[PDB]
């Protein structure tokens, strides 16, 4: 597609202003914490970037990248700064540069993790704005599901 980014585009390569728009979405209801907490450890990022290529249950056997403690450092540092400081922005700044070789997170990995945590506002934004793709499917039950009119 004639999209700005591809599933294989690393988050650090995404325009800072684009990441910022995503950050403000994740700042709501402190959703950045939910995403940060489920980031699988040791993912073959490039292999997991394609649609349906990130098997969450399989990936988590290797554990999670961050702990409840790594999440605090973001809260701590941001709390020292003014109330309008984006914690999601700090979270992504740390995550985007993390890893070594094929460990740097990508747009495709982000999208699938957003879906796993039911962060649909962020996921829809990444799908449409970043990938020019259609919004991901919703579950049948739970807070993320649609409601039909009888």
């Amino acid at each position: 597609l004639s999209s700005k980014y591809s599933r294989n585009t690393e988050l650090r390569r995404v325009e800072d202003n684009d990441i910022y728009r995503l950050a403000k979405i994740l700042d709501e209801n402190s959703c950045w914490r939910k995403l940060m907490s489920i980031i699988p450890k040791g993912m073959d990022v490039q292999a997991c970037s394609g649609a349906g290529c990130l098997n969450f249950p399989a990936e988590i056997k290797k554990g999670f990248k961050y702990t409840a403690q790594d999440v605090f450092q973001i809260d701590e540092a941001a709390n020292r700064l003014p109330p309008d400081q984006s914690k999601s922005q700090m979270m992504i700044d740390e995550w985007k540069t993390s890893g070594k070789l094929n460990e740097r997170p990508t747009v495709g990995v982000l999208l699938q993790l957003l879906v796993q945590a039911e962060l649909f506002s962020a996921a829809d934004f990444v799908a449409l704005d970043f990938l020019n793709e259609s919004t991901p499917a919703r579950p049948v039950d739970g807070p993320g599901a649609l409601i039909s009119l009888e």
Binding site: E28, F120, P143
Partner: peptide, 19 residues
């Protein structure tokens, strides 16, 4: 804020919930 914010639900879906 929670249901509409995080899940990006529409006014129509809200209408259906009320219904």
């Amino acid at each position: 804020n929670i249901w509409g914010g995080q899940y990006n639900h529409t006014v129509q879906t809200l209408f259906a919930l009320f219904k």
